Structures are given as structure tokens and as C-alpha cells.
Amino acid sequence: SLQKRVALVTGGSGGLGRVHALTLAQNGADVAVTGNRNIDKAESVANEIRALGRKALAIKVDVSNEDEVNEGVEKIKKELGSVDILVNNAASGIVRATLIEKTAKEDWDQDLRVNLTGAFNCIKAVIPDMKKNNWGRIINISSVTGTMGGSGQCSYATTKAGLIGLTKTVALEGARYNITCNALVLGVFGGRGREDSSFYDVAEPFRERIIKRTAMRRPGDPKELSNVLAFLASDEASYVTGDAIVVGGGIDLFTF
Amino acid sequence: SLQKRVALVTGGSGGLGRVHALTLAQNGADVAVTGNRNIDKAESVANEIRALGRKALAIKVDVSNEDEVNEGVEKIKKELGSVDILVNNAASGIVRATLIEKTAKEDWDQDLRVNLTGAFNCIKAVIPDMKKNNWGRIINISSVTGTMGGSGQCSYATTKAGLIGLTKTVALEGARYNITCNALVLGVFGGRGREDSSFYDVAEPFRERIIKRTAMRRPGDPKELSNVLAFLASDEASYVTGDAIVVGGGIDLFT
Numbered sequence: 488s489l490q491k492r493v494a495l496v497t498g499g500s501g502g503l504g505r506v507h508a509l510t511l512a513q514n515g516a517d518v519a520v521t522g523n524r525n526i527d528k529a530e531s532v533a534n535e536i537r538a539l540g541r542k543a544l545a546i547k548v549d550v551s552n553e554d555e556v557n558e559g560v561e562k563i564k565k566e567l568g569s570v571d572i573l574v575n576n577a578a579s580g581i582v583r584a585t586l587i588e589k590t591a592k593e594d595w596d597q598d599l600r601v602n603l604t605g606a607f608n609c610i611k612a613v614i615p616d617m618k619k620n621n622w623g624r625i626i627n628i629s630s631v632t633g634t635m636g637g638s639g640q641c642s643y644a645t646t647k648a649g650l651i652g653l654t655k656t657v658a659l660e661g662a663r664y665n666i667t668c669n670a671l672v673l674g675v676f677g678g679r680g681r682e683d684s685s686f687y688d689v690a691e692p693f694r695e696r697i698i699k700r701t702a703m704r705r706p707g708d709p710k711e712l713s714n715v716l717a718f719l720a721s722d723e724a725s726y727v728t729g730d731a732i733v734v735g736g737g738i739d740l741f742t743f
Numbered sequence: 744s745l746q747k748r749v750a751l752v753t754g755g756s757g758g759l760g761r762v763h764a765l766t767l768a769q770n771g772a773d774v775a776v777t778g779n780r781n782i783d784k785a786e787s788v789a790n791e792i793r794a795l796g797r798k799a800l801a802i803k804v805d806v807s808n809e810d811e812v813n814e815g816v817e818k819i820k821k822e823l824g825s826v827d828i829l830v831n832n833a834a835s836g837i838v839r840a841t842l843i844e845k846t847a848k849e850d851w852d853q854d855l856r857v858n859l860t861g862a863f864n865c866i867k868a869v870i871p872d873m874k875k876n877n878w879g880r881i882i883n884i885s886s887v888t889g890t891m892g893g894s895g896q897c898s899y900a901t902t903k904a905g906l907i908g909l910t911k912t913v914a915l916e917g918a919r920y921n922i923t924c925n926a927l928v929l930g931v932f933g934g935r936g937r938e939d940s941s942f943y944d945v946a947e948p949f950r951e952r953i954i955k956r957t958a959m960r961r962p963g964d965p966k967e968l969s970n971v972l973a974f975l976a977s978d979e980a981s982y983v984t985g986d987a988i989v990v991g992g993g994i995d996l997f998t
């Protein structure tokens with residue numbers, strides 16, 4: 488159980504981040520979710536968490552902004568208690584499709600602020616209370632695009648790979664505090680549609696082709712990702728740290 | 744033989760970058776190097792290239808400034824010809840020793856702008872002509888801190904890891920034009936002192952512990968890295984792309 492633990496899932500307002508929040512809630516956690524451009528969708532997830540019988544808080548955070556992150560975490564600490572479980576799920580530039588030389592510097596810059604500096608801000612905010620409490624779980628969200636590359640996705644491949652480096656440094660700083668830090672290296676996820684997964688911003692016939700590159704010949708359910716995350720977030724995962732764990736249904740193997 | 748090739752070594756003003764530029768020249772390349780804080784050191788490096796009887800050009804570039812980068816590449820093209828070989832060797836935050844919670848946003852943001860946006864801006868400027876000339880070599884400089892972490896180095900480990908992701912995407916986009924893109928994953932390097940390596944910014948007690956955790960029980964000579972970089976830059980390395988090649992004397996093994 489994650490009973491008596493408080494979770495912050497950045498990008499909790501919808502997609503996979505929402506299923507992360509509900510999964511952490513179902514397993515006993517009280518959960519905060521962020522919203523940026525969807526603070527209303529965040530509040531609605533918080534009400535789904537409350538309907539499960541847990542405490543919840545929707546806060547409005549652009550994770551690139553250290554003032555909004557710090558204010559948000561301090562708000563969680565007052566209302567729920569210090570963050571025990573951090574999920575850096577918020578991402579920009581998930582489905583860009585532009586060669587590097589046609590990629591706009593301001594798109595690159597935003598992707599790096601959200602995907603890297605977002606994780607840096609949130610980790611900096613929560614880790615002092617995790618150390619003080621001698622317990623912590625930080626889960627960073629990477630992609631096989633980060634470990635295998637992706638044509639037309641220079642910022643996403645850079646930021647998702649960068650998060651593995653960040654994971655390993657933070658695993659080192661946190662180790663002697665029972666703070667683990669791990670990266671989930673995601674394949675592709677389905678669910679009901681765009682509300683559940685950014686995969687649906689990819690043209691259906693390109694998705695069918697990516698699915699045929701998975702050994703399981705199907706995109707993952709959001710739950711198949713959230714359940715790995717929930718195990719890593721448990722006390723029982725105390726000797727797993729600094730790993731890049733692939734949740735990709737064989738997308739990263741030599742599939743025919 | 745790199746005869747009839749134009750190389751750009753970012754941070755060729757000193758350290759390993761200087762030896763990179765010098766080694767590529769010895770191998771026959773016309774070599775542009777950058778300076779930012781040390782344009783005079785960069786002009787000095789260009790003159791050492793000329794002593795080898797090659798063409799050179801110091802250019803004053805902050806690789807984070809795309810304007811500065813675009814002009815610099817424009818300037819190289821006119822004087823030397825289109826860049827065939829890009830070495831993204833310029834780095835900020837190389838020897839931070841600050842836990843993440845005590846690390847300042849401004850130091851983080853600068854490290855990211857230089858180590859990631861630098862590589863982006865330079866690749867952005869040179870790749871159109873590499874594609875036009877149907878040939879190209881991009882060498883990104885990573886670090887075992889990127890693949891194994893390092894306490895108090897959140898920006899360095901983040902950026903050095905991110906350069907491997909960037910390598911793989913550029914390898915996929917460049918492959919059909921005989922443009923390879925590869926990362927060198929460095930251990931630690933000695934040489935003459937602070938002149939040849941930013942290893943010497945690390946306190947001597949810490950350097951001895953790091954050295955004893957290399958299987959070869961010694962830092963690398965800068966040349967031992969530059970020679971791997973030179974081979975990847977050759978026509979013969981044409982089937983090697985998107986790899987993270989470790990040059991680190993067993994620092995990444997269970998020593």
C-alpha cells in the first residue's frame with residue numbers, strides 16, 4: 488500500500504498522468520495533480536481521486552517556472568503533507584515531426600524548459616523534505632525515442648535521454664535517504680483515445696505501423712504503465728534505483 | 744586522410760577541443776575553431792594549424808546564440824568552405840559539485856543552453872550543406888557522468904545524456920546523405936595540466952579516487968580521445984552512426 492504517502496503527478500490533468508494519479512490513489516496514496524492550460528481537467532481528476540476515498544489537490548503549475556512549482560509543492564505540504572512520491576509526467580513537444588534544421592529554436596527551448604527544467608524544478612522542490620523524512624520515490628518519464636532516436640523529434644529524443652542522466656545523478660544524491668529515482672522508458676500507449684494518450688496525435692496509419700514494431704502487436708494500456716510506476720513507488724522497490732526500465736511491449740527489440 | 748575537408752571544433756580555444764582541431768589538421772583537414780571568453784587562445788590555435796600548412800579560422804561564438812553560430816558558419820563557408828566535420832566540444836558546468844536542491848536555476852539553464860542548444864544550433868547551421876554535398880560527420884562529446892550519473896552534477900549528467908538522444912535522431916535524419924552522427928562517451932583526461940583538461944578543476948584527492956576506478960589506473964592522454972574522433976571523422980567510419988562510443992580506460996567497468 489501507498490497509505491500515508493502523498494504523490495504529486497505533474498501533467499495529471501489528463502492522458503497517462505491522470506491514470507498514474509488514479510493508480511497511485513487506488514493503491515492508497517493521497518495525490519496532487521498539476522494543470523497548466525487545463526486546471527479544470529486537473530480539478531476533475533482530483534474529484535475522481537476523492538470519489539476513490541483519498542485526499543486530492545489540483546494545483547496550477549507550469550513546471551518550467553520555479554516560483555509556480557515551489558508555491559505548488561508548499562501548497563501540497565500545507566493541505567496533504569510533504570510530497571513522498573514525485574512523477575515527472577508533464578512533457579512538451581511529444582509529437583513534433585520536423586527535421587532539426589527546420590526545427591524552430593523557440594519550440595526546442597520550450598521542450599527543454601518543460602521536459603528537463605520542469606523535472607529539475609519539481610525534484611529541487613520535494614527532495615529536501617524527502618531527505619528530512621528518510622523516504623522518497625522520484626519517477627521520471629522517458630521514451631524509447633530517447634534511447635533509439637526518432638526522426639523529426641530532436642527535442643523529444645534529447646529531453647527523454649537527458650532524463651535518464653538526471654535520474655542517475657538524483658539516485659546517487661538520494662540513495663542514503665531511502666530516496667530512489669528511476670526512469671520509465673515508454674513505448675506507445677492506447678486507451679480510449681486522445682484523452683488517454685498523445686499517441687492519437689499520430690496519424691492512424693503511422694500508429695498501425697508503430698504497433699507492428701511492438702513484439703506484442705498492440706499499444707500498451709495506460710494501466711500497464713501505471714502499475715509498473717505504482718510498484719516502483721512502493722516501499723518494496725527500495726533496492727531499485729537509477730534504472731531506465733522499458734515498458735514498451737518489445738518495441739525496443741528486433742521485432743518482425 | 745581528411746584532405747579537402749573543413750572541420751569546426753566548438754571550444755577549440757583550449758583543452759581537448761584544441762587537440763581535436765590540431766589532430767584533424769594533422770590528418771589533412773582545414774579547421775575552424777571557436778572562442779567565447781578566449782578568442783586570442785582560439786586565434787593562437789588557428790596559427791598552430793597554419794604551421795601544419797592548413798587553412799584555419801578563429802570565430803568568436805557563444806554556441807547558445809544561434810545568430811552568433813549562423814554568422815560563424817557563414818564566415819567559415821566563405822574562408823574555408825562548407826563544414827564537413829562538426830565537433831560539438833564546447834561545454835558549461837563541466838565540474839559543478841552542488842546537490843540538485845542547492846543548484847541555481849541560472850547555472851542549470853546556462854549548462855542546458857550551452858551543452859544542448861549549442862549542439863542543436865551548430866548541427867542546424869551545418870547540416871543543410873552536408874546534405875547538399877551528400878557527406879557529413881557530426882561528433883557529439885558526452886561523458887560517463889551522463890550514462891552512470893554523478894553526485895552534485897545534475898546539469899552535466901542531464902546534458903551529457905541528452906547529447907546521446909540528440910546523436911541518435913540526427914543519425915536517423917542524416918543516414919540517407921552519408922552524414923554520420925556519433926557520441927564519444929569520455930572518462931577523465933590528463934595531459935599537461937588545466938591547459939589540456941578540465942579534469943584539473945577537480946581537487947587532487949578526488950582525482951586520485953577517480954583515476955584508481957579506471958581499469959588502466961591513469962587518465963587518458965587527450966590524443967587517445969582525439970585519435971578516436973579523427974577515425975570517426977574519416978570516410979572509412981561510414982557504417983558507424985548513432986553510437987555512444989566510450990573512451991574512458993575502463994572507468995565504466997566494475998573496476
Ligand SMILES: NC(=O)c1ccc[n+]([C@@H]2O[C@H](COP(=O)([O-])OP(=O)(O)OC[C@H]3O[C@@H](n4cnc5c(N)ncnc54)[C@H](OP(=O)(O)O)[C@@H]3O)[C@@H](O)[C@H]2O)c1
Nearest residue numbers: 498500502503522523524525549550577578673675676685
Ligand atoms: N502516450 C504515449 O504513448 C507516450 C509514449 C512515450 C512517452 N510518453 C510520455 O508520457 C507523458 C505523458 O504523455 P501523454 O500522452 O499523457 O501526454 P498528453 O496527453 O499530451 O498530456 C500532457 C500533460 O502534460 C501537461 N503539461 C504540458 N506542458 C506542461 C507544463 N509546461 N507544465 C505543466 N504541465 C504541463 C499537460 O497539462 P495541461 O493539459 O493542463 O497543460 C498534460 O497533463 C509524457 O512525459 C510523454 O513524454 C507518452
Ligand SMILES: NC(=O)c1ccc[n+]([C@@H]2O[C@H](COP(=O)([O-])OP(=O)(O)OC[C@H]3O[C@@H](n4cnc5c(N)ncnc54)[C@H](OP(=O)(O)O)[C@@H]3O)[C@@H](O)[C@H]2O)c1
Nearest residue numbers: 754756758759778779780781805806833834929931932941
Ligand atoms: N577533460 C575531461 O577530462 C573531460 C571529461 C569528460 C568530458 N569532457 C568533455 O570534453 C569537452 C571539452 O572539455 P575540456 O576539458 O576541454 O573543457 P575546458 O578546458 O573547460 O574547455 C571548455 C571549452 O568550452 C568553450 N565554451 C564554453 N562555453 C561556450 C559557449 N557558450 N560557446 C562556445 N564555446 C564555449 C570554451 O571556450 P572559451 O575558452 O572561448 O570560453 C572552451 O574552449 C566538454 O564537452 C566536456 O564536457 C571532458
